[PDB]
mmCIF file of C-alpha atoms in Angstrom:
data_model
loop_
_atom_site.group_PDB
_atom_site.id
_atom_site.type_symbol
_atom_site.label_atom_id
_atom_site.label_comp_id
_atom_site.label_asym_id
_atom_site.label_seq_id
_atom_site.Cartn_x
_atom_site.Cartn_y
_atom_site.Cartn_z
ATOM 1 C CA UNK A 2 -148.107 -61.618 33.193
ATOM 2 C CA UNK A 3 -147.066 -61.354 36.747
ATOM 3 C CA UNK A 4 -147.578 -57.464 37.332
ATOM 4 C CA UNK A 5 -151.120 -57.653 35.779
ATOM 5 C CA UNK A 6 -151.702 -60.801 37.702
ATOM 6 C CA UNK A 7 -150.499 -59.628 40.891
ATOM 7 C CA UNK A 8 -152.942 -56.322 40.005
ATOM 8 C CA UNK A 9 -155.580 -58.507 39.424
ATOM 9 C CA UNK A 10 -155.026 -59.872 42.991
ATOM 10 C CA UNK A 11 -155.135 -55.988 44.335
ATOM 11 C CA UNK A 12 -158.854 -56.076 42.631
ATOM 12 C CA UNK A 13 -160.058 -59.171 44.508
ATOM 13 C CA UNK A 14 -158.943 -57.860 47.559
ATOM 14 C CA UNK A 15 -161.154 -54.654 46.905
ATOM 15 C CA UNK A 16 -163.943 -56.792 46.453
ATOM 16 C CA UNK A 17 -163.391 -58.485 49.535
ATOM 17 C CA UNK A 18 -163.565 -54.978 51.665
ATOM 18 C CA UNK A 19 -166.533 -54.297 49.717
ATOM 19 C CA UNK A 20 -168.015 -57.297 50.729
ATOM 20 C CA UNK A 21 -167.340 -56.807 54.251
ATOM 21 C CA UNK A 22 -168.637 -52.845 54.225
ATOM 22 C CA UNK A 23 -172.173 -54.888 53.291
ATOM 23 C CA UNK A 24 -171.350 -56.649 56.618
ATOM 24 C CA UNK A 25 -171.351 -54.152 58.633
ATOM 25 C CA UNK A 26 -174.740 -52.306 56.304
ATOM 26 C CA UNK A 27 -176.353 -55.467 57.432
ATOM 27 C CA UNK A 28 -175.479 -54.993 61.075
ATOM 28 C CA UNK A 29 -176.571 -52.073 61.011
ATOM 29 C CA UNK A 30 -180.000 -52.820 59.909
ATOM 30 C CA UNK A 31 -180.526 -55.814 62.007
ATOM 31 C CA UNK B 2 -140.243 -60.573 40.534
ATOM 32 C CA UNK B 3 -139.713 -57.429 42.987
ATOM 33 C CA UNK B 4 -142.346 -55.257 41.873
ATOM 34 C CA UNK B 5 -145.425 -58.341 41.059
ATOM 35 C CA UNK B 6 -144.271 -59.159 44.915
ATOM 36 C CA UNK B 7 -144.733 -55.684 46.539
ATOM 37 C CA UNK B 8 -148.548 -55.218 44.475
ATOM 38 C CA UNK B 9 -149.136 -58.952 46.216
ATOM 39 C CA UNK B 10 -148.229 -57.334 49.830
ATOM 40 C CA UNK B 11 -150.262 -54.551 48.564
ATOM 41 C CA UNK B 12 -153.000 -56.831 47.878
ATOM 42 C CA UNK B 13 -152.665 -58.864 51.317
ATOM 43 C CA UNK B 14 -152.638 -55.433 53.551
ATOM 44 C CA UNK B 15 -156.277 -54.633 51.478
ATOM 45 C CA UNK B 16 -157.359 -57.883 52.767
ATOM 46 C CA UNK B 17 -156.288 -57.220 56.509
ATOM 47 C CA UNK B 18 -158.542 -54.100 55.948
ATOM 48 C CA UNK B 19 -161.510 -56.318 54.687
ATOM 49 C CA UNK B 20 -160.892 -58.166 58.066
ATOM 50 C CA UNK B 21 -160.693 -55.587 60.203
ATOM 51 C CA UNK B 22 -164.340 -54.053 58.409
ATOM 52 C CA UNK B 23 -165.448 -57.743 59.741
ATOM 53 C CA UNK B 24 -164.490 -56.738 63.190
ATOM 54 C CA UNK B 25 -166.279 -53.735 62.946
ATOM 55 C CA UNK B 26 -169.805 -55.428 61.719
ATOM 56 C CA UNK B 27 -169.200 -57.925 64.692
ATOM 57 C CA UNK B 28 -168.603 -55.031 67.435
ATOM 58 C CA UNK B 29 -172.190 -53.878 65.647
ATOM 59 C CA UNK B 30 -174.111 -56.961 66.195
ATOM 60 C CA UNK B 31 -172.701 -56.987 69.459
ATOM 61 C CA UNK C 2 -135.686 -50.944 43.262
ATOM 62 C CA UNK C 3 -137.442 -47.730 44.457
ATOM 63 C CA UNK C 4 -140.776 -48.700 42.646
ATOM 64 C CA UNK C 5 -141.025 -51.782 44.259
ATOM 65 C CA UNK C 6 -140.486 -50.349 48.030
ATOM 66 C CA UNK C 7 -142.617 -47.761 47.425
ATOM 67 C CA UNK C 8 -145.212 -50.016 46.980
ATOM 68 C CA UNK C 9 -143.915 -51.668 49.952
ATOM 69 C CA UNK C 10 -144.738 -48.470 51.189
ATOM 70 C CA UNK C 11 -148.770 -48.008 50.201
ATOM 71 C CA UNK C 12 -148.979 -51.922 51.748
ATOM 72 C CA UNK C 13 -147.685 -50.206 55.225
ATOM 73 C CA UNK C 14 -150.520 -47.130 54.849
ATOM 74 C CA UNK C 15 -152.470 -49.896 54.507
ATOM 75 C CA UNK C 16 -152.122 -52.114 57.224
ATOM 76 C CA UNK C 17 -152.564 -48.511 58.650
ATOM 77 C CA UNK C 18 -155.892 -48.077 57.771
ATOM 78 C CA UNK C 19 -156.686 -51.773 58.883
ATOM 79 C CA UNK C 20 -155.011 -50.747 62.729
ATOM 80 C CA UNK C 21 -157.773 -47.919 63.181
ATOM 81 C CA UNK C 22 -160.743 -49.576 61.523
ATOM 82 C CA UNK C 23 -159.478 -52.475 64.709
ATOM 83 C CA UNK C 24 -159.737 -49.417 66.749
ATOM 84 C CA UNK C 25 -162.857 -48.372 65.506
ATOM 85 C CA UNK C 26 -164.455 -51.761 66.085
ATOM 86 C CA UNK C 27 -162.986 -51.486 69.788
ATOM 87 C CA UNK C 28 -164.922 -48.331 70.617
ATOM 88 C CA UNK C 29 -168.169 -49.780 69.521
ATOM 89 C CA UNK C 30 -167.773 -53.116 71.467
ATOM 90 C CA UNK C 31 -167.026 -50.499 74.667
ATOM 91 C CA UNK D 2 -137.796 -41.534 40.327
ATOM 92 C CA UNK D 3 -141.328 -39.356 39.555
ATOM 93 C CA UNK D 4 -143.052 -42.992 39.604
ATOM 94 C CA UNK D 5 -141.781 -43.987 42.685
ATOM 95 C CA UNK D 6 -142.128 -40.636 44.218
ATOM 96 C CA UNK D 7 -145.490 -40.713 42.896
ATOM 97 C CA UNK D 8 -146.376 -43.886 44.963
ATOM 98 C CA UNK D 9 -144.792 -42.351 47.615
ATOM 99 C CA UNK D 10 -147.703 -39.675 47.599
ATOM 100 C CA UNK D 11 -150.146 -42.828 47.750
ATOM 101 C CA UNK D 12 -148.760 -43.906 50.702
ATOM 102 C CA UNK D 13 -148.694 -41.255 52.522
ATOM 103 C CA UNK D 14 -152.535 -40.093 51.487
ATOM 104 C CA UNK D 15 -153.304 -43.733 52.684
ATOM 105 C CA UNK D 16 -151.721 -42.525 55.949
ATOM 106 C CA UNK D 17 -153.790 -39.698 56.183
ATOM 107 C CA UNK D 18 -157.235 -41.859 55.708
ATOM 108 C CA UNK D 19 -155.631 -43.868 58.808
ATOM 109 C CA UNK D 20 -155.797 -40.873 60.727
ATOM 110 C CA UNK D 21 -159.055 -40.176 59.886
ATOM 111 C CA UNK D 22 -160.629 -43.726 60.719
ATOM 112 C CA UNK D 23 -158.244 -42.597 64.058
ATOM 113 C CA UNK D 24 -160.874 -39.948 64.253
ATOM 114 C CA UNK D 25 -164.088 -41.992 63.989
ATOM 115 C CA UNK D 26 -162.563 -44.041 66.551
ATOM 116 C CA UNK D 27 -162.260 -41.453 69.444
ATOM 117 C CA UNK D 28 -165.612 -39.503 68.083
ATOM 118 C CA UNK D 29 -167.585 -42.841 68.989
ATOM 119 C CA UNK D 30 -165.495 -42.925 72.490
ATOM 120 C CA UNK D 31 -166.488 -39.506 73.503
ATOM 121 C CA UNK E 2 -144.964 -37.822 33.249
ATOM 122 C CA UNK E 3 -148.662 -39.618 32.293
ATOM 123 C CA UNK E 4 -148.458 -42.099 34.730
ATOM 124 C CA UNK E 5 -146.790 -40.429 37.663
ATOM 125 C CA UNK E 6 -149.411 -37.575 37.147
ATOM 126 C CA UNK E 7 -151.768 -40.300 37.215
ATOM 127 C CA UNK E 8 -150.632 -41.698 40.573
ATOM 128 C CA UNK E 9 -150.404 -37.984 41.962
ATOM 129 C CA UNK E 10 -154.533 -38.056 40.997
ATOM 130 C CA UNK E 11 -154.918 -41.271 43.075
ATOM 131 C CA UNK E 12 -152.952 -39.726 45.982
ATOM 132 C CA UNK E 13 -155.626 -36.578 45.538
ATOM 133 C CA UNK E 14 -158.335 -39.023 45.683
ATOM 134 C CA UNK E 15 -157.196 -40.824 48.555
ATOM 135 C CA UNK E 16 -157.216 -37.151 50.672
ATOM 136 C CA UNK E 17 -160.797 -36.945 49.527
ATOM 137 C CA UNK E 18 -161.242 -40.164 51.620
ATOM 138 C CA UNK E 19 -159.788 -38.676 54.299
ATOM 139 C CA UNK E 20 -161.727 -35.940 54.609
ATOM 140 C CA UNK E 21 -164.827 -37.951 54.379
ATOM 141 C CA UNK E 22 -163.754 -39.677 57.251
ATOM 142 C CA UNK E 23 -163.214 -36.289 59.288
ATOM 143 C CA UNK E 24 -167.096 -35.414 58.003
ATOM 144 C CA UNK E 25 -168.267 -38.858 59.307
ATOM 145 C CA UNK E 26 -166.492 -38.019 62.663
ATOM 146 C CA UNK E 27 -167.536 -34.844 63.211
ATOM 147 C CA UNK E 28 -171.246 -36.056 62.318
ATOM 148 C CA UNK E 29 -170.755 -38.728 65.055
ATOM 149 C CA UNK E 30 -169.450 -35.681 67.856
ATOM 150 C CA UNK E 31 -172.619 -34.079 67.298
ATOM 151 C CA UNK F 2 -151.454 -44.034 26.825
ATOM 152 C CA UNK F 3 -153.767 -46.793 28.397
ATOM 153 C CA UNK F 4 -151.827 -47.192 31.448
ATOM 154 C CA UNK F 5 -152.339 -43.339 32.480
ATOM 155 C CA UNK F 6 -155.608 -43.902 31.745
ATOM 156 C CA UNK F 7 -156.740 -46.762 33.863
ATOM 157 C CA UNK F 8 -154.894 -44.876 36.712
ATOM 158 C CA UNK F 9 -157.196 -41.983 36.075
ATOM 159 C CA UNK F 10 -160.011 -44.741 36.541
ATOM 160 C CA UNK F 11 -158.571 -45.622 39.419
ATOM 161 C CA UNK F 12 -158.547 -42.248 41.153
ATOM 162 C CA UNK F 13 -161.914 -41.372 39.625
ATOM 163 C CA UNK F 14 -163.369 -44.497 41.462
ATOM 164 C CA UNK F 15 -161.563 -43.289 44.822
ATOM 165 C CA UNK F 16 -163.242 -40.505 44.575
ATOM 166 C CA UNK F 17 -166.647 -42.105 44.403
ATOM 167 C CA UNK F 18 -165.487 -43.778 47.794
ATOM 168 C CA UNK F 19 -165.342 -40.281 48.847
ATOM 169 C CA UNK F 20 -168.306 -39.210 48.171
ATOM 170 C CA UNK F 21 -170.270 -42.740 49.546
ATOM 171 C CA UNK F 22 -168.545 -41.900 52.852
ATOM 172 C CA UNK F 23 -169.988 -38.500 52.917
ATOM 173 C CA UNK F 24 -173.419 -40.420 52.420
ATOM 174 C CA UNK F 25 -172.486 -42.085 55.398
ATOM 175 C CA UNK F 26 -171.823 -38.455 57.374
ATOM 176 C CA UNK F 27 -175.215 -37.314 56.317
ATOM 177 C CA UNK F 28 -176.779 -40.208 57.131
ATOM 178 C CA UNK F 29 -175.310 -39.893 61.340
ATOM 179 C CA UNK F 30 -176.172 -36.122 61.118
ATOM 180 C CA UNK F 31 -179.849 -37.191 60.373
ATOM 181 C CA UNK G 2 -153.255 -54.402 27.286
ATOM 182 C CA UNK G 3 -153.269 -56.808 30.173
ATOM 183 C CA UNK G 4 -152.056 -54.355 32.972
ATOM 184 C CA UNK G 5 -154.775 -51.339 31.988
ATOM 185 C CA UNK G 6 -157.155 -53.962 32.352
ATOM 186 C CA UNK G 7 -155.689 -55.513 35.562
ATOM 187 C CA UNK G 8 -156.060 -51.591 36.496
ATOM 188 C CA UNK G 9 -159.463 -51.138 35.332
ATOM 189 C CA UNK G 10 -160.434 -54.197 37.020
ATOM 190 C CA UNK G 11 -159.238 -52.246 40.683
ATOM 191 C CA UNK G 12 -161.456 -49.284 39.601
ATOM 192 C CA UNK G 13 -164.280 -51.991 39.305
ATOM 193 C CA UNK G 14 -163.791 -53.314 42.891
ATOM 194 C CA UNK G 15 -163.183 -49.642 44.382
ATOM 195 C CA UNK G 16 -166.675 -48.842 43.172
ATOM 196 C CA UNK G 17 -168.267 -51.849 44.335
ATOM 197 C CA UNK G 18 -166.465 -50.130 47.549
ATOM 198 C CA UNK G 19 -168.561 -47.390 47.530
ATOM 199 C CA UNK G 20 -171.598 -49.005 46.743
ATOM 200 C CA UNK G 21 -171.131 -50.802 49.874
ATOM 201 C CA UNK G 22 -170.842 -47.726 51.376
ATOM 202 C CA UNK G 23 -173.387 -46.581 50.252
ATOM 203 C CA UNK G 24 -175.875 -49.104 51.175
ATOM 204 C CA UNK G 25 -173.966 -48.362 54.814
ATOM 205 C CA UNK G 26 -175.821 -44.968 54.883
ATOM 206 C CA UNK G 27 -178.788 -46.495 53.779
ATOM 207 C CA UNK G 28 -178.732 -49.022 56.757
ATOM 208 C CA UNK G 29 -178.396 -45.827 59.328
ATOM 209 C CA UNK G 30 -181.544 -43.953 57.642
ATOM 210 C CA UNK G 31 -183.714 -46.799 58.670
#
């Protein structure tokens, strides 16, 4: 369905910011 | 339909976040 | 519809949110 | 409606974290 | 209702954010 | 109901943003 | 049903969120 799709699109956008918070964990280690 | 297309706009400010966490990690690295 | 704009609404917080993490990464470049 | 109003109360927490990255900003510029 | 009240908890969580944000300022001030 | 309930998720997992950015706080006050 | 999943899967990505985060701390404790 569209609404769960569209929710599901919400999630991989999450994962995205998570992805770039271990960005900046790696900047700060380096 | 109206609400599937505000979650997506939801969904595409999360990724302007994600972004701007990638300008953050840069500004770390210098 | 009302639900629909008030998601409209959380997008707007969170293009928010992705304005001061931009201004967060400017104070660490300076 | 108690849903949209609900949302509503998402948004405007959202705004609140905004401030607070806001904060972080001007913390690292003083 | 369940699901606004549900929401309402999100919007609570969200303010918990925030005021993480205000401890990770103030931590950078000192 | 199941929709209430994954909402609750939701917020639960906000909060355990919360608490990761007060790891963060700690972390600068160290 | 497929929209409490779609939700649970946002609860997912939120706490890979703060995982990130926390691995963020980690990177300022050495």
């Amino acid at each position: 369905g569209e609404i769960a799709q569209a929710x599901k699109e919400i999630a991989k956008a999450x994962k995205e910011i998570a992805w770039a918070x271990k960005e900046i964990a790696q900047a700060x280690k380096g």
